[PDB]
Design a protein around this ligand. Structure first.
Ligand SMILES: Cc1cc2nc3c(=O)[nH]c(=O)nc-3n(C[C@H](O)[C@H](O)[C@H](O)COP(=O)(O)OP(=O)(O)OC[C@H]3O[C@@H](n4cnc5c(N)ncnc54)[C@H](O)[C@@H]3O)c2cc1C
Ligand code: SF4
Ligand code: SF4
Ligand code: SF4
Ligand code: SF4
Ligand code: SF4
Ligand code: SF4
Ligand code: FES
Lengths: 67, 1178, 118
């Protein structure tokens, strides 16, 4: 699913400096960061995809594997 | 500004303020290591190689970030700095998984670039392979014939099927080189130094070869009648023919070496003579005294030394053999003597060795071959007595021995067996148990206990000052390549000594992979080795004809294509290797866990290797800061960090545009750009600066070639130092083997090859027949826009000679700017993008031209304002203050009306400089002003200076005319930093238009359709492939003549097909999109020997036109001057080029703003099709 | 050219020039060079000008446009100069000039060529 992130992306829109918060909410929702969800975030907010992957994999709290 | 006074390495410098220490040291010839520093990017500070010690500061300061202040004392080579850099390099090496030089190169005693010339053979560059061999081996063919090839024992292909036939390939290329005139390396100017070399063997000849290259005067004193050493008087003719040796020695003599034969040291020449009249003396006498049998009766007649017997045989001197011959020994001498005796008519030849077969110093192949020829062997047998009856040897008594214990070698020691004795009947006994240095030749020298000359290791210097030694005279009997390596090292040392400073040989440190196992090559394709052609044993045991024969060219290429390419492709341009060589790095002390993350990729251009990444971040920083695509990024954190594309996807699945900047900026070969050649090979190339011709930005580049093949392309650090996908990677068509090199004419309804004269005659007669039958203006010339200015001018001259005004191009769009301003040209230059206040990028400016996208990014970063007008998404919309998505030119009419309404147009001045203003006001009086148009008008009016960048190949002419109107109304034309710049689609569109090619595709097609044009002369265009609808149009031509690089789909239907050459094979002049005149240099000579200008000049001379490059250049200069366009950075400064000298404001009806069109240029269309097939962007 | 290729002629003339003969082209007697000049600075003068003036038709209207001399037409064709041919060509004569002109016109794209001999 991708509509679950629709409110979060609507709350943190207008500024591309809130990507960590969006990633944290996605991590809470899906219990992980699927590549399709990262793609949807990258498309919706306008931040480059490599930046998204870097910020996601920087922290040990974000894990990209299904539970 | 202020001038700061600094002191770097005890040298006072007066630098400028706001400069880093790195820049000051670079501009003052002080070397500071750096790995993560680029001039276009902000400082990073990762590698920590540029640390320098600044007086007054306790910590080492990075030279890439610290700014020079007044009264600064900087030490860039203090021991603290050296230790810091060495530790950083050791830490970087601890995580490095690479191979600086392949195991084949390291196993060769001469360290010949085996991978290099093998790969050059696999590409068809035989002369380059020979030249690479001669950098370390002056005798390719001779050594390739006779060498145990230890390199094949270390070849990594042993782990897959079978080691590469390196010796066979070297012999093949040596034979090719000797067949024609041989290759002589360049000779440095004469240094006035005389060197005396004693001995004409491999060591002495190698020293002469590598000292004559330095410009010294070389004389070689040789005792024997002919030079060659044991390569001539040792190795027999069936293994090394003497004609090859003579040819190689003649090649050496062609370099200026004077070989005085029949001169002996101590007999004809004394050592004092050489020491007095020569600066340096190199002794290569070799071991020329065979060991005696060491048993009673060894002096009996019928016992002869092995090397003496072989020398007598080679010299054709009479020897005394018999029916029964025994050879005592197990080396090369014993086997050669046995086989020579077999070929000299001996009925039985038996070789006696004191050890067993396994410990035989001779090669297994030689022993097996001798067994096939008929040599018998006795092992574990040593001589103790010679039974002679009447002064002649009758037999020999041997004592059988057995392997008792270990020895000095540590393998096994043979000891005698008591009570075991055997009598072997003997008519001849050849004692070949080894050779020793002749004591007479080495008089007055300190001798090693073994009998060889004692020299200082690493300097090859004897006890006497100025006297050097090497080869078998120093090391004892070894293989020939060891002697050649000794000669080369001694030559380098002697050159250093002659220059004044004697420096011992220093062996570089290489990064090598020792954890490799065959399981790493389980996926490689298994290919059979080249067969060895060996003469039949029965037929070869009677003559001295050569046994093995050289491989064929097809077999050589197939064998060289089996190479695994073990060595690093970035070896000759890796800076990490240079730095670890500059510092005494000890990597073993810090070696530990090392990542293995390299997985092969399918990208056709860029190859990434995580195992050689030093994580400097340069690729990421250049893809993000300069290019602006941001397709790379860091992944993970800490020791696990890795540079990966977007979401770890393959580079083709990301937004990467294949510019190659990441490959060009990488220091340590982790990211590389694949060479446009058949087989990848790390070679030392030569770089020539030329100009890209694939669009009008005219980016300069350095083409790096080796032979007649292009091996790489690098950007020039002019501004952003960037190249797009085309300029960087589409140069691959130069090496393409599908290029036509000979003309084709229609015989019996089929195209077949002919000569240039006949083809050009046929072309001229066909054009003349068309003109005669169908009258004037019946021949169309459709010339590509990648030709030089001279070629376009010559085509215009020829069109005048054919009485045809149809001179145009299928890539040419209808012009609007010459009807407004007077000239179809860009008003300003690319240098005013940075200094303009507002930039209006119209069309796919960033997408089509990546370099222009980077330029716009830099300009906006500098302070400019960007407004992008397009229909779809653009990469420039990230930094644009206003973005407009339009599809009609009503937007520009509404903008004009909005400008008029807010009184943003000074009507007095505009009416003074621009006629046709009442009609424009009437035209825009009825359109409806939208919010977007009003905002754009407010932006345009509020800008002091404005530049309109228009992608000509994706923007309709109505849009260009409307933008010209907008610029004229707001008075943004004819002034510095204001104007319109057209980015043309091809390299020389502007030059072609200036020369006289000004007919669009539509006009030519219409003329053909009406039947007015009956013949076409297409120069490097592809109407058939690019457009299907043109296929019927080309059916209306009676005669079609095609001048193309490739046999295109439109060249297959022509009557005459003339071959063209690439732009790197043709010198001339091109014109940038802004009007700048640039020079096309000659990177390579034309493959067929005829340039495009030469071909067109021949064709024109067939019509009576006497022209050349200089005359055409002069006419081009006069043409540009007559239009006031020559060397003018800003156009219409004084007045516009219309006859009224006023602006004819563009009044027209609405139309689509942007158009999508194909590319008719052959090479650009082919590369675009290639990129589309590979799913790549640009 | 289909009867005598000009490459062979060029090679033979180059062979002649290799003997020391200096061939000054584009020099015309009476226009660039006067006979007095040659008679003054040369011991002997040999004139090999040849017959280079085609005969006119000798009938009224021979000067009308579209009527061209045979050797002049062949010289224009050989020099690759543009000639004004047409669908219909008639050659008046019966010598080598007439046949060469007819065959050249056939190869130059004329639909029908007719030779008129008295
Ligand atoms: C029978 C035989 C077979 C061999 N087969 C092979 C093989 O298959 N593969 C391989 O790799 N190697 C082989 N070798 C080894 C190779 O031939 C030698 O190791 C190599 O040639 C060493 O060359 P060098 O210059 O040290 O001395 P050499 O070539 O032995 O001699 C150098 C020169 O010194 C000259 N000289 C000697 N004394 C004087 C003096 N007083 N004044 C002036 N000049 C003098 C001699 O005339 C000679 O030309 C073989 C050697 C022998 C003897
Ligand atoms: S990247 Fe440089 S240091 Fe590493 S193996 Fe290749 S050449 Fe050697
Ligand atoms: S000279 Fe001998 S060791 Fe060196 S590359 Fe050739 S065959 Fe191998
Ligand atoms: S495969 Fe090629 S590069 Fe590797 S060791 Fe063999 S010859 Fe050298
Ligand atoms: S080639 Fe691709 S990844 Fe490399 S710098 Fe260019 S756009 Fe970025
Ligand atoms: S791949 Fe990128 S980060 Fe790694 S060494 Fe090359 S340029 Fe530096
Ligand atoms: S932008 Fe144009 S000139 Fe520059 S490299 Fe690309 S194709 Fe060549
Ligand atoms: S820290 Fe300055 S170049 Fe790396």
């Amino acid at each position: 699913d991708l509509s679950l992130l629709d409110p979060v992306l609507d709350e943190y829109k207008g500024e591309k400096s809130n990507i960590i918060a969006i990633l944290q909410k996605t991590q809470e929702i899906y219990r992980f960061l699927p590549l399709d969800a990262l793609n949807y975030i990258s498309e919706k907010t306008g931040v480059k995809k490599a930046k998204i992957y870097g910020i996601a994999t920087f922290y040990a709290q974000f894990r990209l594997k299904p539970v | 500004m202020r001038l700061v006074r600094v002191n770097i390495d005890n040298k006072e410098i007066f630098a400028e303020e706001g400069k880093t220490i790195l820049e000051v040291a670079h501009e003052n010839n002080i070397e500071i290591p750096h790995l993560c520093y680029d001039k276009r990017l902000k400082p990073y500070g990762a590698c920590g190689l540029c640390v320098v010690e600044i007086e007054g500061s306790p910590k080492l300061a990075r030279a890439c970030s610290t700014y020079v202040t007044d009264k600064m004392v900087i030490k860039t080579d203090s021991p603290r700095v050296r230790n810091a850099r060495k530790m950083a390099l050791e830490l970087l090496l601890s995580e490095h998984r690479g191979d600086c030089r392949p195991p084949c190169v390291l196993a060769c005693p001469a360290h010949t670039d085996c991978q290099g010339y093998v790969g050059l053979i696999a590409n068809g560059q035989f002369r380059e392979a020979v030249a690479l061999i001669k950098e370390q081996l002056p005798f390719p063919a001779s050594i390739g014939r006779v060498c145990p090839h230890p390199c094949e024992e270390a070849c990594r292909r042993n782990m897959v099927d079978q080691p590469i036939a390196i010796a066979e390939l070297k012999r093949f290329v040596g034979d090719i080189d000797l067949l024609d005139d041989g290759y002589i390396p360049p000779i440095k100017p004469k240094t006035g130094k005389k060197v005396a070399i004693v001995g004409g063997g491999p060591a002495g000849l190698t020293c002469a070869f590598f000292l004559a290259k330095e410009g010294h005067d070389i004389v070689v004193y040789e005792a024997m009648p002919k030079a060659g050493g044991m390569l001539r008087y040792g190795i027999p003719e069936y293994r090394l023919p003497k004609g090859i040796l003579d040819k190689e020695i003649e090649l050496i003599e062609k370099m200026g070496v004077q070989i005085k034969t029949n001169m002996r040291l101590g007999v004809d020449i004394s050592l004092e003579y050489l020491r007095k009249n020569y600066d340096a003396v190199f002794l290569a006498v070799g071991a020329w005294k065979s060991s005696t049998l060491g048993c009673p009766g060894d002096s009996a007649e019928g016992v002869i030394g092995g090397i003496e017997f072989l020398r007598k045989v080679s010299m054709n001197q009479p020897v005394n053999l018999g029916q029964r011959v025994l050879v005592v020994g197990g080396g090369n001498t014993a086997m050669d003597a046995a086989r020579t005796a077999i070929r000299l008519g001996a009925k039985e030849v038996t070789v006696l060795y004191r050890r067993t077969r396994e410990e035989m110093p001779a090669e297994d192949i030689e022993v097996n071959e001798a067994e096939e020829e008929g040599v018998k062997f006795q092992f574990l047998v040593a001589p103790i007595e010679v039974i002679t009856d009447g002064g002649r040897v009758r037999a020999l008594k041997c004592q059988r021995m057995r392997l008792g214990d270990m020895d000095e070698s540590g393998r096994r020691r043979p000891v005698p067996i008591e009570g075991a004795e055997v009598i072997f009947e003997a008519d001849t006994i050849i004692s070949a148990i080894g050779q020793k240095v002749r004591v007479e030749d080495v008089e007055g020298l300190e001798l090693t206990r073994h009998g060889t000359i004692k020299v200082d290791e690493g300097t090859y210097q004897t006890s006497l000052e100025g006297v050097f030694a090497g080869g078998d005279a120093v090391t004892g009997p070894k293989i020939a390549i060891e002697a050649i390596a000794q000669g080369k090292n001694a030559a380098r040392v002697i050159d250093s000594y002659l220059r004044g400073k004697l420096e011992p040989i220093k062996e570089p440190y290489y990064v090598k992979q020792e954890d490799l196992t065959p399981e790493d090559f389980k996926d490689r394709e298994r290919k059979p080795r080249v067969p060895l052609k060996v003469a039949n044993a029965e037929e070869r045991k009677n003559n001295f004809r050569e046994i093995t024969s050289t491989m064929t060219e097809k077999e050589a290429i197939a064998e060289a294509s089996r190479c695994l390419e073990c060595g690093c492709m970035d070896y000759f341009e890796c800076q990490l290797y240079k730095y670890v060589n500059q510092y005494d790095v000890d990597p073993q002390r810090l070696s530990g866990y090392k990542h293995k993350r390299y997985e092969p990729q399918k990208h056709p251009f860029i190859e990434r290797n995580p195992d050689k990444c030093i994580l400097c971040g340069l690729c990421i920083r250049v893809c993000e800061e300069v290019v602006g695509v941001c397709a790379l990024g860091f992944v993970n954190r800490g020791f696990e960090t890795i540079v990966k594309p977007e979401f770890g996807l393959p580079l083709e699945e990301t937004s990467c545009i294949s510019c190659g900047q990441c490959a060009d900026i990488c220091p340590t070969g982790a990211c590389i750009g694949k060479q446009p050649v058949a087989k990848q090979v790390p070679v030392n190339t030569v770089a020539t600066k030329t100009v890209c011709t694939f669009c009008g930005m005219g980016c300069e580049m350095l083409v790096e070639t080796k032979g007649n093949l292009i091996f790489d392309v690098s950007p020039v650090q002019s501004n952003e130092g960037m190249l797009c996908a085309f300029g960087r990677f589409g140069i691959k068509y130069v090496n393409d083997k599908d290029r036509i090199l000979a003309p084709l004419i229609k015989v019996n309804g089929e195209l077949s090859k002919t000569t240039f004269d006949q083809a050009l005659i046929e072309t001229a007669k066909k054009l003349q027949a068309i003109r005669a039958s169908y009258g004037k203006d019946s021949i169309a010339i459709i010339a590509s826009q990648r030709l030089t200015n001279e070629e376009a001018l010559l085509l215009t001259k020829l069109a005048q000679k054919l009485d045809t005004t149809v001179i145009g191009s299928f890539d040419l769009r209808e012009s609007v700017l010459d009807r407004i301003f007077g000239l179809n040209a860009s008003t300003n230059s690319f240098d005013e993008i940075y200094s303009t206040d507002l930039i209006v990028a119209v069309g796919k400016v960033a997408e089509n031209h990546a370099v222009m996208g980077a330029k716009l990014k830099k300009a906006v970063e500098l302070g400019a304002k960007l407004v992008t007008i397009n229909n779809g998404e653009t990469r420039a919309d990230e930094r644009a203050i206003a973005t407009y998505k339009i599809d009609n030119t009503a937007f520009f009419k509404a903008t004009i009306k909005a400008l008029f309404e807010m009184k943003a147009v000074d009507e007095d001045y505009v009416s003074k400089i621009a006629v046709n203003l009442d009609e424009l006001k009437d035209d825009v009086k009825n359109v409806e002003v939208t919010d977007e148009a009003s905002e754009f008008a407010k932006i345009i009016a509020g800008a002091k200076t404005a530049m309109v960048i228009v992608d000509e190949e994706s923007v309709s002419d109505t849009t260009i005319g409307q933008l010209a109107n907008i610029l004229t109304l707001t008075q943004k034309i004819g002034r510095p930093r204001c104007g319109i710049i057209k980015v043309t689609g091809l390299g020389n569109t502007q030059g072609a238009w200036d020369m006289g090619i000004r007919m669009s595709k539509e006009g030519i097609v219409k003329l053909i359709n009406e039947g007015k044009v009956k013949a076409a002369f297409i120069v490097s265009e592809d109407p058939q492939a690019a457009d299907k609808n043109l296929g019927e149009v080309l059916d209306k031509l009676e005669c079609l003549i095609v001048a193309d690089v490739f046999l295109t789909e439109t060249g297959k239907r022509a009557d005459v097909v003339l071959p063209l050459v690439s732009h790197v094979e043709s010198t001339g002049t091109v014109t940038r999109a802004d009007g700048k005149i640039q020079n096309l240099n000659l990177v390579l000579k034309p493959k067929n020997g005829l340039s495009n200008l030469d071909l067109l000049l021949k064709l024109a001379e067939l019509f009576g036109l006497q022209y050349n490059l200089e005359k055409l250049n002069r006419e081009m200069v006069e043409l540009l001057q007559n239009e006031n366009k020559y060397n003018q950075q800003i156009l219409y400064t004084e007045g516009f080029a219309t006859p009224d000298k006023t602006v004819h404001l563009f009044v027209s009806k609405d139309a689509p703003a942007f158009v999508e069109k194909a590319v008719f240029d052959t090479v650009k269309n082919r590369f675009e099709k290639y990129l589309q097939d590979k799913h790549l962007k640009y």
